[PDB]
Amino acid sequence: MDHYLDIRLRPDPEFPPAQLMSVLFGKLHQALVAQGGDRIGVSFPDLDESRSRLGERLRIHASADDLRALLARPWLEGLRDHLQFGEPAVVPHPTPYRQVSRVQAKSNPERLRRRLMRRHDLSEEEARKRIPDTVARALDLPFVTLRSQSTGQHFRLFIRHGPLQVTAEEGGFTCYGLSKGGFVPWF
RNA sequence: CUAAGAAAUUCACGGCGGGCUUGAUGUCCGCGUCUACCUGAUUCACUGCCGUAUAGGCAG
Numbered sequence: 001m002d003h004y005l006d007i008r009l010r011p012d013p014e015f016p017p018a019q020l021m022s023v024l025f026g027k028l029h030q031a032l033v034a035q036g037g038d039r040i041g042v043s044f045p046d047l048d049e050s051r052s053r054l055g056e057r058l059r060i061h062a063s064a065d066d067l068r069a070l071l072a073r074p075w076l077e078g079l080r081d082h083l084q085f086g087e088p089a090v091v092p093h094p095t096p097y098r099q100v101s102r103v104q105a106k107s108n109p110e111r112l113r114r115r116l117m118r119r120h121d122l123s124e125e126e127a128r129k130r131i132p133d134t135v136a137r138a139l140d141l142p143f144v145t146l147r148s149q150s151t152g153q154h155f156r157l158f159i160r161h162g163p164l165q166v167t168a169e170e171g172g173f174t175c176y177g178l179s180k181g182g183f184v185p186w187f
Numbered sequence: 188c189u190a191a192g193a194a195a196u197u198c199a200c201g202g203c204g205g206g207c208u209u210g211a212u213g214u215c216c217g218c219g220u221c222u223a224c225c226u227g228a229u230u231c232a233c234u235g236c237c238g239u240a241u242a243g244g245c246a247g
Contacts, residue, residue, distance in 0.1 A: 018229040029247090104245070107232045112241070120239085131241050138232075145229045148247040153233045155247075174246090 001061045004185070005070075006045070006086045009056040017056045020082050022144040024058060025157075029146070029176045031075035038172030040066060043100055043184045044142075047161060052142040054159070060177065061184045064088055095187040099162035099179040105137040161186075 009020050032040060040062040046055025060067070067088035070076075076083070106112060112135070113127035122130070141158040148155070157176070164186060171181020 014225075016228070019227095022229060102245090105232080106241080108234090109241085111234075115235080116241085118235095135241055136232090143229070143232085145231080146247080147231090148234085150247055151234055153235095153247080154231045155234080156229075156232050157247090158232085176247090 001039070001041070001063060001184075002091055003062060003064045003067055003088050004091050005060050005062075005067045005088045007058045007060065008084050008086075010082055010084055011056075012082060015082070018054070018144075021054055021056070021058070022146060024079060024083065025144045025176075026146050027075045027079060028058075028060070031070060031073060032175040032177060034073070034075070035066070035069070036175075038174070038180070038182075039063065040177055041100060041173040041179060041182050041184045042177035043186065044159070044161070045187070047142065052140055054142045054144070059184075061091075091185045092187060095185040096164035096166060097168040097183040098164050098186045099183055100177075101160060101162065101179040102174075102176065103139065103141060103158050103160045105139055105158070107136050107138065109133055109135055 007024065009017050009024070011017070012020065028042070040060065043059040043061065044054045045057045045059050047053065048055065060070070062070075071085070071088070109131050113124070113131050116122055116127045116130060117124075139158050141160050143156045143158040145154060145156050147153075159178070162179070165183065168183040168185070169181070171179065171183065173182045174180050
């Protein structure tokens with residue numbers, strides 16, 4: 001999109017930036033379910049690939065009316081004293097483009113064993129011989145930790161910012177602001 | 188370039204027999220331990236779905 005809003009974490013004595021980053025991402029996800037649509041995507045400008053850090057900025061990309069609607073909604077109630085806003089402003093030009101997609105992994109071999117039990121009626125030893133322990137993949141990606149409201153689990157949502165492309169293509173976003181095809185301007 | 192330079196201790200073996208340690212006993216007065224704290228560092232790498240798949244994706 002052509003408009004962006006930069007949301008920076010204020011430094012807090014009581015909270016690390018990753019905790020406030022996760023809470024802001026969670027309330028943003030609830031705001032995108034409350035809004036609907038696939039037109040709104042996010043980006044993390046001070047990302048550090050070396051230490052796997054998301055920084056302390058979130059850059060949301062949408063139209064201008066969407067950003068001005070999201071300024072005055074109750075998804076920022078309780079977070080306004082931990083954050084500072086810029087203005088919804090036009091993206092500078094030219095900028096490279098990159099994708100912001102969630103990267104899931106097979107980090108629980110036992111869950112895949114239970115899936116093979118449910119789909120092939122096998123046993124525990126058949127699943128453990130068919131799925132060994134070496135298939136687990138640990139990620140060198142920064143992440144936010146959310147709690148679901150439908151189910152009662154807490155999960156690390158790992159994020160990877162894709163390679164820089166000189167142009168953007170058409171694609172929608174999920175209700176997490178993440179790329180299901182769409183691209184955001186990286187600056 | 189060394190008080191340098193060298194070196195086979197080893198064959199065999201019955202330690203056992205016997206025994207009353209005993210009497211007696213006042214530990215004991217007295218006592219101000221206080222003061223003040225972020226356990227949270229992403230610290231719950233989870234649950235499930237599509238797929239024949241462990242290959243690869245997806246959902247919260």
